DNA sequence: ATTATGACGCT
DNA sequence: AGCGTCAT
Ligand SMILES: Nc1nc2c(ncn2[C@H]2C[C@H](O)[C@@H](COP(=O)(O)OP(=O)(O)OP(=O)(O)O)O2)c(=O)[nH]1
Ligand SMILES: [Mg+2]
């Protein structure tokens with residue numbers, strides 16, 4: 001009863017940029033705006049692999065991981081932008097730099113956790129206390145929430161989507177207790193007002209549109225963000241969780257879309273997140289381990305305690321390239337030339353990072369995949385990263401992998417290499 | 431021949 | 442440390 005934690009202590013937002021790489025290319029090339037378009041890596045094999053898709057193109061069934069030649073069968077007028085190639089490999093610098101633009105804007109409002117190139121969590125708890133102090137119990141106008149959906153509303157006793165959005169928002173605002181500065185629903189609402197402001201700032205200052213979720217923790221904020229894309233934001237209240245989860249496939253919750261989620265389904269004989277509530281915490285721990293079990297017990301009740309980490313910069317800087325089927329590297333000269341290409345991109349990015357961010361990486365991780373191995377990584381070895389020198393890094397990477405060569409000949413490489421990966425890690429301030 | 435990352439957990 | 446999972 002009165003002691004049962006409800007996980008309503010924080011206001012957390014998740015901001016995800018809509019079809020990010022597409023928007024970066026559409027900003028640069030206005031001929032791509034408001035068109036079905038996609039971003040592709042490479043071109044020779046099946047037209048290149050699609051990694052981002054505009055919402056107009058998604059209406060035709062174009063998806064990520066589709067070959068552009070097949071996408072063109074679904075959408076013959078699909079427009080394509082190609083990722084830049086440098087030193088023989090895909091170079092994502094333009095999108096990393098665009099991401100920095102967005103993350104700096106969001107950092108003006110609150111401390112953010114960079115979760116990916118195009119999404120960040122925001123801890124708005126303190127900003128919400130501030131805005132509530134400034135409001136002085138003044139009600140929140142629907143005008144301040146022009147792109148907000150309230151999940152689960154409207155409910156109870158129009159045939160157009162904006163009309164439904166506004167009915168739901170009206171029902172929500174009508175039920176608000178605006179004189180209770182500690183009401184979680186009011187705090188979420190103020191958080192949504194702030195996120196409207198943040199998203200407006202991102203669009204004004206970059207041209208990019210985004211979606212967002214506002215809830216009491218990261219998992220619900222992420223889930224919420226996905227409910228009304230593109231260019232909209234969604235508030236998921238604590239009270240909305242029983243109905244939301246009652247039909248929510250377990251795999252939709254972040255961390256459960258893989259083997260653990262499949263095992264929850266098969267072991268417990270359930271389909272939906274809400275069905276987890278019928279198990280004790282000890283039962284879930286017995287199947288899925290102490291940490292997963294406690295997390296699932298709380299998560300299916302809408303409660304999650306994982307903090308928004310104050311981290312705007314990536315923890316690692318890496319370069320990787322696959323060498324599929326017959327492009328596999330089978331000679332020493334090959335392996336060395338490509339280690340050097342990867343190392344030269346890494347050196348460029350590391351030098352920029354040291355100048356921008358006052359830090360130096362101290363460990364170089366070298367990962368490879370050999371032909372025939374099913375695992376995405378066949379071997380990981382670390383060595384010291386003591387100088388930002390591409391020839392030195394590529395020589396060191398060769399030194400740490402050179403005994404994987406089964407060939408008795410010194411010039412041949414067997415089994416041939418289908419993937420090279422260099423990653424700089426363990427940053428120290430400088 | 432799904433590609434290029436990147437975070438985090440396990441032991 | 443090296444490997445696995447999950448994300449996309
Ligand atoms: N290189 C590479 N980049 C990827 C891959 N998957 C996604 N990305 C990039 C391109 C996307 O624009 C960007 C952000 O991914 P998201 O999952 O947020 O999707 P996106 O923003 O494209 O669309 P969304 O509106 O969020 O559904 O990450 C991939 O497999 N390889
Ligand atoms: Mg994202």
Ligand SMILES: [Mg+2]
Nearest residue numbers: 019052064449
């Ligand atoms: Mg996506």
